[PDB]
Amino acid sequence: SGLSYPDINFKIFSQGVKNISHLAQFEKALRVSLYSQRLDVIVRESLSSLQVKLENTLALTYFTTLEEIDEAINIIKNLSNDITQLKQLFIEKTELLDKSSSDLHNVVIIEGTDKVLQAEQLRQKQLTEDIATKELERKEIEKKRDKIIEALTDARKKLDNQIDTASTRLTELNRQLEQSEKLIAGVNAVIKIDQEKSAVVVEAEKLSRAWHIFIHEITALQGTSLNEVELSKPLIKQQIYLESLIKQL
């Protein structure tokens, strides 16, 4: 008594699972989308199944207690059993959602990615350093061919061997530069995947704790079952809260 439901911003969650499922481009980053998808569906239906179950039980709570109004001891049996079954649904859905969340949190990607960045940086500086020198060589023999052509012919056609070798080296290194840049971009993509997946996991923990808070509130009633008017209020409070959460997607 006296607690408040945590602030849940499902925009980051929704757009994060969207990003991750749509960022499966650039090997192992595939699997992080699969588990996050399972979690994604787990929540997606659970909060909806909890909604329709919450409202239904509402339509039943005033039903059973309408049978309590009819006299104006089985109603207590099925009443407490029904509210405890709702609590049990909250139990199992918290267990399932949190199992998915803590299972998703185990798998990670970094600690084996910055290594590749370190290697790629040195190869990249070596590449951009050597391409300039090979281009200098190409330019030297280019002046040598231009000055002689602009006017023996055996030499004019023999220098083309060195021209073609230098050109093949240039194309041989440019594709390597593109490969290194692609690797760098993919590593940065996997880093951002980590970041947004972490936001998703934090949101999952927040929602699990919110469900824990409401189930704590449900347990606060126990089996006294003295008043219905009060019982209706926390149920509809989670109804609004969870419905607003369902709205945010």
Author numbering: 10 to 35, 45 to 90, 109 to 187, 246 to 343
Question: Which of the paper's sentences describe this entry?
Answer:
We have unraveled structures of the soluble components and the pore assembly of the YaxAB cytolysin from Y. enterocolitica. The crystal structures show an atypical fold, comprising a head domain reminiscent of ClyA family toxins and pronounced coiled-coil and foot domains unique to the YaxAB system. In line with our finding that the isolated YaxA and YaxB head domains form spoked oligomers in solution, the YaxB head domain in isolation was sufficient for recruitment to membrane-bound YaxA. Together, our biochemical data support a role for YaxA as the initial membrane-interacting subunit of the toxin, able to bring the lytic effector YaxB to the target cell surface. Therefore, we propose that this class of toxins defines a new structural family of α-PFTs.
The orthologue PaxB produced better diffracting crystals than YaxB and thus served as template for molecular replacement phasing (the two proteins share 40% amino acid sequence identity, whereas YaxA shares 18% and 22% sequence identity with PaxB and YaxB, respectively). Our structural data confirmed that YaxB is a true homolog to PaxB, with a RMSD of 2.1 Å across 210 Cα pairs. Notably, the YaxB foot domain could not be resolved in the 2Fo–Fc electron density map and therefore remains unmodeled. Because our monomeric YaxB model was incomplete (with the foot domain not resolved in the electron density map), we superposed both monomeric YaxB and PaxB coordinates with protomeric YaxB. This likewise revealed only small conformational changes in the YaxB head domain (RMSD of 1.3 Å across 178 Cα pairs), accompanied by a slight movement of the coiled-coil stalk away from the incoming YaxA. Using a liposome float assay, we could establish that YaxA binds membranes while YaxB fails to do so.
